[PDB]
Amino acid sequence: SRYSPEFKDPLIDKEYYRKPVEELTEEEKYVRELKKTQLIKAAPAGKTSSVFEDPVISKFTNMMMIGGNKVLARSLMIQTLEAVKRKQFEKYHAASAEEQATIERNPYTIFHQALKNCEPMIGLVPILKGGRFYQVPVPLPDRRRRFLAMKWMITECRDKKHQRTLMPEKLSHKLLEAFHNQGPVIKRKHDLHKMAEANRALAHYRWW
Amino acid sequence: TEADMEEYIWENSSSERNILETLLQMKAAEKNMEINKEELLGTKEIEEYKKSVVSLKNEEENENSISQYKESVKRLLNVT
């Protein structure tokens, strides 16, 4: 890194700075007076202080980027969000007054919930015991759970099973399926739970 | 030829030929027999139109030159 260890990461949050002084504790007062003497890295060109910023969608976009082509990756993302919203507006106008109350039309709410429905609770990690590796079911950290949900969704959309279907139409279709606890990405989560439940006998190999 | 000229000249150009042909059709529509070229191309409106076309041809095109050209065409075509 071209930053020395003395550089601290920037905090990009308008609310954090407009907070009155009276509400601050003696510990939060120390951190604010400390940062006035520290070196701060330049804010990356990715995140800003915008009110439409979504760190989860930004991360999903980078995981779709091929060869640093962010423009194309970002283009596929907004086309998916538009495709999801148009499908929900079409399902909304074609529904009855009672069914309309249960139809979600916010693509950001659908995207977050669809990924949350695909996150696995437990995984298989190799543990060495007696000179052999055993696939031991273990709890996954929050980072790993969220990462696996995104990776499974992107991998499913790149599968060759889809013939000539463009990414925004494929992804929008998979998100709405996962949003309703259906589709192949939900099935992949169930398989990891079934394969972790089969190795239930090896769970005691864990030591944390 | 005209393609060899590096400075646009309004005389004997398509602009002069087109505007003159238009004013003759307008005079005929009004059933007026004052079809003299020297009279039609001698008014002040033609001088403003000539000045506007030459500016668009020889100088850099911009919004102010297109607006000046617009006001000169509206007066010749009686578009108020």
């Binding site: 920037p10 890295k41 330049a42 800003t48 | -």
Partner: protein, 132 residues
């Protein structure tokens, strides 16, 4: 004409920018004499021009005229962001300047391209360790 303004500079990779921020304006930004949305057709680049003014709650309050040369489209948007942020510090309170500093808006990004070394494919990429 008696209109107060400030001037500053910024660098990002090989791009160099120089911005003139007027104390009063309507939010107009000219990049090399072009409207900013015509010069930066990519939305991410325009989001970088919005970051400084939005972070201090001053969208639509200043006019900016900047000139940028070198680098690519994203590096130029980054150099303009730093140049406008520095010049904008003249029209905000001292406490607001410290917030911009802690938000990473006043730091020159030192990340530049690394040279290729001889005997390897890239700056870090090595040639394939031949199968033994």
């Amino acid at each position: 004409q008696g209109m107060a303004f400030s001037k500053s500079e910024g660098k990002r990779k090989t791009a160099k920018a120089e911005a003139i921020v007027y104390k009063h304006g309507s939010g107009r930004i000219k990049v090399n004499g072009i409207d900013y949305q015509l010069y930066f057709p990519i939305t991410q680049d325009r989001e970088q021009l919005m970051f400084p003014f939005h972070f201090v709650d001053r969208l639509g309050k200043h006019d900016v005229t900047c000139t940028v040369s070198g680098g690519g489209r994203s590096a130029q948007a980054g150099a303009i962001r730093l140049a406008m942020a520095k010049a904008l510090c003249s029209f905000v309170t001292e406490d607001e300047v410290e917030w911009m500093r802690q938000a990473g808006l006043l730091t020159t990004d030192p990340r530049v391209r690394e040279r290729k070394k001889p005997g390897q494919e890239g700056a870090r990429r090595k040639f394939t360790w031949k199968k033994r």
